[PDB]
């Protein structure tokens, strides 16, 4: 084999963030899409908005694009949280 194109990003939010502002979810989604567009063609972008670990997945067209994304985002700060970015393990669901 698998040449991984999917990036799993964590700690981007906590689901309570969307409890009292119905606009934050779409703002975070767009923030991520705009940034990730610089790394490669996005095939699919998902926010797991009820996952307690603040998870998003970004699928790219090429594995090099996923690599560039992981290199740039892992350990970066987002909205006051330090995020992780890693290649999908191919098994875990969110």
């Amino acid at each position: 084999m698998r040449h991984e194109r999917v990036v799993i990003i964590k700690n981007m939010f906590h689901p309570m963030d969307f409890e009292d502002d119905p606009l934050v979810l779409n703002e975070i989604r767009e923030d991520l899409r705009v940034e990730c567009s610089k790394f490669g063609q996005i095939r699919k972008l998902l926010l797991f908005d009820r996952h307690p670990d603040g998870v998003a997945s970004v699928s790219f067209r090429d594995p090099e694009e996923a690599d560039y994304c992981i290199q740039t985002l892992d350990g970066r700060w987002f909205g006051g949280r330090q995020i992780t970015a890693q290649a999908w393990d191919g098994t875990t669901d969110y």
């Binding site: 975070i28 923030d31 705009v34 940034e35 970066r76 700060w77 987002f78 909205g79 006051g80």
Partner: peptide, 7 residues
């Protein structure tokens, strides 16, 4: 955007 915002 929220990129690079610290606590």
């Amino acid at each position: 955007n929220r990129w690079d915002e610290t606590p």
